PDB file of C-alpha atoms in Angstrom:
ATOM      1  CA  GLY A 200       0.047  -0.175   0.031  1.00 48.71           C
ATOM      2  CA  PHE A 201       1.032   3.561  -0.410  1.00 51.54           C
ATOM      3  CA  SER A 202       0.678   6.262   1.553  1.00 53.19           C
ATOM      4  CA  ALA A 203       1.869   9.563   2.176  1.00 50.30           C
ATOM      5  CA  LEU A 204       2.882  11.244   5.458  1.00 53.32           C
ATOM      6  CA  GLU A 205       1.638  14.808   5.757  1.00 54.02           C
ATOM      7  CA  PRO A 206       3.985  16.773   8.011  1.00 51.20           C
ATOM      8  CA  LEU A 207       3.264  16.611  12.152  1.00 51.54           C
ATOM      9  CA  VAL A 208       5.103  19.495  13.837  1.00 51.69           C
ATOM     10  CA  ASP A 209       8.522  21.172  13.364  1.00 51.11           C
ATOM     11  CA  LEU A 210      10.176  21.593  16.898  1.00 51.38           C
ATOM     12  CA  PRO A 211      12.538  24.853  16.633  1.00 48.00           C
ATOM     13  CA  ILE A 212      15.453  24.484  18.669  1.00 48.73           C
ATOM     14  CA  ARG A 218      19.911   5.412  21.416  1.00 48.07           C
ATOM     15  CA  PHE A 219      16.878   4.862  20.731  1.00 47.61           C
ATOM     16  CA  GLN A 220      14.115   3.626  23.229  1.00 49.87           C
ATOM     17  CA  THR A 221      10.472   3.176  23.604  1.00 50.16           C
ATOM     18  CA  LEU A 222       7.965   2.385  26.424  1.00 53.96           C
ATOM     19  CA  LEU A 223       4.602   0.490  26.414  1.00 52.04           C
ATOM     20  CA  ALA A 244       4.803  -4.114  21.231  1.00 51.29           C
ATOM     21  CA  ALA A 245       6.032  -5.390  17.850  1.00 50.54           C
ATOM     22  CA  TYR A 246       7.480  -2.406  16.701  1.00 49.27           C
ATOM     23  CA  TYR A 247       9.780  -2.121  13.775  1.00 48.36           C
ATOM     24  CA  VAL A 248      12.889   0.355  13.337  1.00 51.56           C
ATOM     25  CA  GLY A 249      13.956   1.592   9.557  1.00 49.47           C
TER      26      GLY A 249
ATOM     27  CA  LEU B 498      23.751  36.053  17.035  1.00 50.26           C
ATOM     28  CA  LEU B 499      24.866  32.478  17.626  1.00 49.14           C
ATOM     29  CA  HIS B 500      23.671  29.472  18.676  1.00 50.28           C
ATOM     30  CA  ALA B 501      20.233  28.606  17.333  1.00 52.54           C
ATOM     31  CA  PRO B 502      18.677  30.811  14.769  1.00 51.49           C
ATOM     32  CA  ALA B 503      16.042  32.616  16.878  1.00 48.38           C
ATOM     33  CA  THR B 504      13.325  34.527  15.251  1.00 50.44           C
ATOM     34  CA  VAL B 505      12.487  37.712  17.015  1.00 50.90           C
ATOM     35  CA  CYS B 506       8.883  37.383  14.947  1.00 54.02           C
ATOM     36  CA  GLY B 507       7.782  41.196  13.734  1.00 51.95           C
ATOM     37  CA  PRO B 508       5.456  43.815  13.798  1.00 49.09           C
ATOM     38  CA  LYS B 509       2.157  43.200  12.360  1.00 48.50           C
ATOM     39  CA  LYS B 510       0.655  45.834  10.333  1.00 46.94           C
ATOM     40  CA  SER B 511      -2.234  44.285   8.392  1.00 42.99           C
ATOM     41  CA  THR B 512      -4.568  46.174   5.859  1.00 44.89           C
ATOM     42  CA  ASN B 513      -7.370  45.775   3.969  1.00 46.49           C
ATOM     43  CA  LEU B 514      -7.954  42.756   1.468  1.00 48.48           C
ATOM     44  CA  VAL B 515      -7.910  43.808  -2.137  1.00 48.48           C
ATOM     45  CA  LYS B 516     -11.043  42.721  -4.213  1.00 50.05           C
ATOM     46  CA  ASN B 517     -10.192  43.041  -7.976  1.00 47.84           C
ATOM     47  CA  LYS B 518      -7.117  45.439  -8.744  1.00 46.61           C
ATOM     48  CA  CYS B 519      -3.749  45.460  -9.612  1.00 46.01           C
ATOM     49  CA  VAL B 520      -1.806  45.715  -6.445  1.00 48.41           C
ATOM     50  CA  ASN B 521       1.647  45.062  -4.793  1.00 50.06           C
ATOM     51  CA  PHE B 522       0.689  42.232  -2.314  1.00 52.31           C
ATOM     52  CA  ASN B 523       2.940  41.391   0.824  1.00 55.21           C
ATOM     53  CA  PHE B 524       1.583  37.889   2.046  1.00 54.91           C
ATOM     54  CA  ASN B 525       4.106  37.259   5.044  1.00 51.09           C
ATOM     55  CA  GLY B 526       6.805  37.034   2.565  1.00 50.06           C
ATOM     56  CA  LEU B 527       5.833  36.687  -1.055  1.00 51.59           C
ATOM     57  CA  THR B 528       6.389  39.857  -2.501  1.00 53.18           C
ATOM     58  CA  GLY B 529       4.792  40.680  -6.155  1.00 54.76           C
ATOM     59  CA  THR B 530       2.129  42.422  -8.215  1.00 55.90           C
ATOM     60  CA  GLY B 531      -1.056  41.025  -9.483  1.00 54.16           C
ATOM     61  CA  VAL B 532      -4.728  40.485  -8.563  1.00 54.34           C
ATOM     62  CA  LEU B 533      -6.186  38.620  -5.803  1.00 55.91           C
ATOM     63  CA  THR B 534      -9.645  36.894  -6.973  1.00 55.73           C
ATOM     64  CA  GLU B 535     -11.315  34.247  -5.278  1.00 54.76           C
ATOM     65  CA  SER B 536     -10.356  30.510  -5.380  1.00 52.23           C
ATOM     66  CA  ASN B 537     -11.791  26.815  -6.646  1.00 47.70           C
ATOM     67  CA  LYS B 538      -8.825  24.897  -5.453  1.00 45.52           C
ATOM     68  CA  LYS B 539      -8.594  23.041  -1.922  1.00 47.91           C
ATOM     69  CA  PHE B 540      -5.525  23.549  -0.144  1.00 45.75           C
ATOM     70  CA  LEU B 541      -4.098  21.083   2.255  1.00 45.47           C
ATOM     71  CA  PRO B 542      -3.913  22.047   6.342  1.00 48.16           C
ATOM     72  CA  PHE B 543      -0.148  22.112   6.471  1.00 50.73           C
ATOM     73  CA  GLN B 544       0.265  23.749   2.787  1.00 48.39           C
ATOM     74  CA  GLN B 545       0.693  27.500   2.372  1.00 49.05           C
ATOM     75  CA  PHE B 546       1.497  28.294  -0.993  1.00 47.03           C
TER      76      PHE B 546
END
């Protein structure tokens, strides 16, 4: 499937996650 | 004039909208000359130009 990713928020100024089956690219 | 690229925004001196004549427009970054008619094209909520 094809789906374009719209901008969510641009913020002016080791990766972990918490709660699964998540990917990482 | 260092560290992050800080923006201090600026003055907000807005004028009335022009219906149909050749005027000089300053649309918050865009400068030119033309007629500002109404539109039928539909934009997106994140798209500005």
